[PDB]
Amino acid sequence: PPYTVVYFPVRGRCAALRMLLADQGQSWKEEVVTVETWQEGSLKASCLYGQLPKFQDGDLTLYQSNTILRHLGRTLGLYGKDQQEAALVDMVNDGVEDLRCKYISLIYTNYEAGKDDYVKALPGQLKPFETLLSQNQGGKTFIVGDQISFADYNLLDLLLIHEVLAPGCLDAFPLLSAYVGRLSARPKLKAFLASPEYVNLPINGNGKQ
Numbered sequence: 001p002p003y004t005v006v007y008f009p010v011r012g013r014c015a016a017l018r019m020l021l022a023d024q025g026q027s028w029k030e031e032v033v034t035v036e037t038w039q040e041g042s043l044k045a046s047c048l049y050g051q052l053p054k055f056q057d058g059d060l061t062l063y064q065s066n067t068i069l070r071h072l073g074r075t076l077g078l079y080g081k082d083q084q085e086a087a088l089v090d091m092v093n094d095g096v097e098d099l100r101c102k103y104i105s106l107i108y109t110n111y112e113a114g115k116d117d118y119v120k121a122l123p124g125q126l127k128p129f130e131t132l133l134s135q136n137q138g139g140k141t142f143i144v145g146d147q148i149s150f151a152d153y154n155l156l157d158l159l160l161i162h163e164v165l166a167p168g169c170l171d172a173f174p175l176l177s178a179y180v181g182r183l184s185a186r187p188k189l190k191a192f193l194a195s196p197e198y199v200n201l202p203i204n205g206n207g208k209q
């Protein structure tokens with residue numbers, strides 16, 4: 001296979017790029033790094049920023065989850081139709097990343113004490129994406145333009161993990177709710193999301209969700 005994903009046995013920051021690969025009919029190798037392998041230290045020391053995911057496209061070695069997403073978007077035609085749409089795709093992805101960072105901070109550093117405030121603040125964090133959908137073909141296609149982009153897969157993952165954290169959090173957002181249902185039903189993505197490869201991994205690395 002042309003691609004290799006090097007990561008812990010977690011959905012985490014690889015869920016969106018895996019959904020992209022599966023939905024686009026791509027083949028890839030999963031190199032699963034156990035915690036004991038990670039703690040041995042040698043792989044970590046060889047990683048550019050000391051972290052995973054690590055990704056290979058042939059001999060091209062990449063780090064940074066959003067770099068991997070942008071690489072796949074650029075090379076597979078999932079980055080809008082022109083330069084203006086490319087910028088809007090980036091604007092969406094950067095917004096997704098900001099909220100993912102807040103989610104990660106809650107999960108790994110403050111779940112017990114922070115969850116109630118986080119969930120009560122979540123409608124204002126999700127509203128921008130409903131607004132974006134409302135401005136693009138009435139929310140009936142994708143987050144930018146009329147074709148899927150890497151930002152759709154990242155936004156879809158962000159929405160799915162927040163549905164687990166806070167069931168019903170999309171109920172006030174009809175376009176986001178329909179968008180999740182529509183994209184999740186795409187045949188290859190639907191089959192992947194139902195597969196043990198996905199279902200039998202935890203969302204995060206610390207048992208919380």
Ligand SMILES: N[C@@H](CCC(=O)N[C@@H](CS)C(=O)NCC(=O)O)C(=O)O
Nearest residue numbers: 012013050051052053063064065066
């Ligand atoms: N900004 C980086 C974040 C990388 C990151 O957080 N890696 C975590 C797994 S999600 C990790 O490797 N933790 C082990 C460590 O830092 O020693 C990205 O988007 O890829």
